[PDB]
Amino acid sequence: MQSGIIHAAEEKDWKTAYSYFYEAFEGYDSIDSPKAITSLKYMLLCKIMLNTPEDVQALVSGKLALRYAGRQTEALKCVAQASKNRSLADFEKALTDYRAELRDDPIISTHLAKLYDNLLEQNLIRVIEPFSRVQIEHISSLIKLSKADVERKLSQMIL
Amino acid sequence: VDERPTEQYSDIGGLDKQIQELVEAIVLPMNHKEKFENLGIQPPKGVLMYGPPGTGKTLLARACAAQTKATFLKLAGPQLVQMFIGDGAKLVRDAFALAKEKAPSIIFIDELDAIGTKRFDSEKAGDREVQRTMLELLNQLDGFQPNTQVKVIAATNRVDILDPALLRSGRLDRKI
Amino acid sequence: MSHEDPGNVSYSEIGGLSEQIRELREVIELPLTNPELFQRVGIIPPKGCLLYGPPGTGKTLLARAVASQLDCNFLKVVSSSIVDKYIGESARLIREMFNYARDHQPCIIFMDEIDAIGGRRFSEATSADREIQRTLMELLNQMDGFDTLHRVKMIMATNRPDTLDPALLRPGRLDRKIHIDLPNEQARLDILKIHAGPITKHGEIDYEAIVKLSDGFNGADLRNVCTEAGMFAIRADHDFVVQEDFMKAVRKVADSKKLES
Amino acid sequence: IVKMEVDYSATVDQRLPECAKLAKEGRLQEVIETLLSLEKQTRTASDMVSTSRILVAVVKMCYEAKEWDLLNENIMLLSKRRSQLKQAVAKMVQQCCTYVEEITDLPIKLRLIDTLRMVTEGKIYVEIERARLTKTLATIKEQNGDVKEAASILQELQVETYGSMEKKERVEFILEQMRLCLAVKDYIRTQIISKKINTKFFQEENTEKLKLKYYNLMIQLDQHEGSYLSICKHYRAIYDTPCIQAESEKWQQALKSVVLYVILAPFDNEQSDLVHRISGDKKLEEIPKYKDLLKLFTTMELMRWSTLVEDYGMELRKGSLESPATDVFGSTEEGEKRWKDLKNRVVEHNIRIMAKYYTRITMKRMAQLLDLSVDESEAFLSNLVVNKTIFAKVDRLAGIINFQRPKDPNNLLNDWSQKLNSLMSLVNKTTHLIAKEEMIHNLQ
Amino acid sequence: SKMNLSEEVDLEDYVARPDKISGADINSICQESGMLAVRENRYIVLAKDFEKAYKTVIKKDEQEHEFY
């Protein structure tokens, strides 16, 4: 689990962090409940960080995942489906619906914020090619957000 | 390689039935080769003369070659066992190549029992390397099937010391 | 590689047991043609097939002929030649021959004699104990030699399937075995006809009478029969071959094999 | 397999028909047991023909005395006793296959599944698999088409298809299972099986109703989700079959479908190659689709679909045969989906042709040309640019677009110098031409 | 672990049996055995693949019970 934690913070690759997290959860198979919950949470967080939420449904449908199912697990599944929909708003909705369940600063809040920035950058870059000059409130309308936050994100990208 | 043997068929004898049989099987496919060609039967090549020493296999083979008036190539079988890797294989390859390049020849390989073992493997030895020389000779027997030239004559004393692999219709067949 | 894809109309030069030839082709060709489907669905293609009939119908002739639909290069490898020394490191030689088959990817390895003289003398149980079987197990574990990628099969032309290490007939082993024995009367007359095909003389088509005297004679023997008939015509310097010449040839070979057996 | 030890051909010949008479209606099981003992004796003696005859006689007795249940446990015991002789059991299954197909009955489905369970213990490619294939096909016919048996025939075919196929029987079996798969309306698995089987071609040069049937079942599979280029490719692959079997109605309707589809496909270099290859066909001229293709393929015309629905839209209402046209656009739900697919397709086509002609076009004119409003036109414009098909830059506050890449001054002066050198070469060629014509003209 | 759990290896594969061989099997052979999970009939690796990997290229050396 710690090796996966370190690799997840290194952020160069997340598949090896997925392997370490799964091994830790496999070690925690109905032995230590809180450590098992943390291991599966980290495993699914790096799985969605791999930008492949398609295998999330199979992973959460696994026997051990159902055995250790919980509100935090369902919140992570909703985060995965938000990544499926590529909706930064849906990800923000899931984070607010389960905030205290995913408010943990260590590799939970940090990675969710990093992923949220990734969707923001991807949405902006995906909608920005056609426009040689576009009004920013139109950009906010397409992204379905306010004006100040969209302007702040677009700035921080361009600085 | 003797360029031309001069020994005559008259100075040998005793086994006249056998010598006439192999004359029909070898010399006639040389002189009257067109007879076999128009008949449609390709003559056999492999003739194995098995019998104790002093029975005249060498004289008969050379006399047959003289009657054919074609090239005669003699192989010293017992000394084909060379320590060099594939040496016997190379010797047999170029021997067949020389015979093919020089007329319908007579390949007179002596000591076929020495060349091929009966696969009586033992802890002392098991004919490991010489099997390479043996399979080369087997693969070279089929080279001259078209146009049916260069006959193979193998001389030994005991035919039974050979495995049932050299004995075949296209391979060594005329055991005399 | 010594023998290659170029071959005669052997498919028609075999004659006897054409159904058996079709069955062996049906077993062999499809994984040989498109092995990618086996990987695509996750099934292991067969490795080869077994052949009986120690002196009978040409097993090597079948190995040649069947490759007509295969466009592959049949290789005639001897079991003694491939094991060489009596050590487990005999796998070096199979690696070389398999690499040769990998270089000429469409290749079938035709084995010469694995159950050395299955009719008599020393079998797998006698003489060399388990040395043949372990060396065959080496080719067995070769089955992961990229069967999807490699167009290589191995035909085992044993003499008698009696002593073949029945541990080598399980699934994943050689598996398939096709029954070949001495040709029946129908196969015998067919192969007599194809042997007489190149022979154009007066004679007659009285093949059944020849079959009656020459029953239970192997295809190689019947090829020898036709050659002996030509030898009889030419020893007598006659440009004609009549059924009497065939009768003399059949009687000669029958007496020869009767004395030798 | 193993050498025969003690034959009992005389014993079975002298006793088996007498046993059949003694149990003509099968009320006696001691007769079954004593033939079991006899075939066990011949089995320990390693005889195959005697055992096969005994098994064939036993099932024949069960046929004539119509004890269906006792047949079920009897064949179960026979197949499970010690596995007996593989030749004999393969035989017995074969006559069981021959018998189950003649009596309709209710529990023949139970007979089919019983033999399936007896043969599914393994030994599929070895010792008869066509029986199991025929039983599964028989189960398909008994259940009259459903999802469970269609899945069963899906998961059965692969072993025998890879091992021992038939150039007609096996492919027909594949065709008879994919149609059930499409009836189930599974798309991922039906696509997988179709793409894993279609690799086996070069038999269709002698097809009668096989390649066309394969293709006409995989038309729906492809066009169901998003396919439009493979659609035209295999519709021309069914078009070339009436070339060798000239039947006018199917030939002409195939021409109508392929011409419509090939234009309807999204723009790409390959689609351009297909449309240019299709155009110029001598046999294509006598249909209105000839005029449709000639108009809508090239020369960058304004494809106002509002005008096209009456100028070349007559195929919807009435044409020569209008049967493929009614299939495509005359349908209600899928027809309106394909109508919308024509609607957008011509919108990107108009955008693309405008790209190579107009540098800056006002927003109102472009929207009017695209038959949509400003927001819809800019949305499709964004859809093109995210696909990198067009080099477009738009000022959204001003509503003005540009299609020309900003010319770097390096290559700008380079093409200027190339223009200079072209002029210089023209001066040289003109000078030589006029001077020499001057020489010819003053030869007086 | 390099190939992430042998590219999602199954649970019932543990190396406890095929590692306690006392048959040399140098790290190069260990890497080769790891890559002999190339049996792509399935998306997962089983203990059979490891057994075949150990079976190929091996020499029989055993009999520690006399010494212990």
Ligand SMILES: Nc1ncnc2c1ncn2[C@@H]1O[C@H](COP(=O)(O)OP(=O)(O)O)[C@@H](O)[C@H]1O
């Ligand atoms: N039929 C024969 N007529 C004349 N000399 C013979 C005859 N048979 C053998 N010889 C003598 O035997 C010698 C050949 O011996 P060799 O070739 O070794 O016998 P084999 O061929 O039986 O091994 C010759 O020098 C020759 O003088």
Ligand SMILES: Nc1ncnc2c1ncn2[C@@H]1O[C@H](COP(=O)(O)OP(=O)(O)O)[C@@H](O)[C@H]1O
């Ligand atoms: N059915 C057959 N038709 C034609 N020739 C045959 C037949 N069977 C055997 N032969 C001949 O026998 C020779 C070798 O046969 P071989 O493969 O040694 O048979 P086996 O292995 O059963 O002894 C070939 O040259 C071939 O011409």
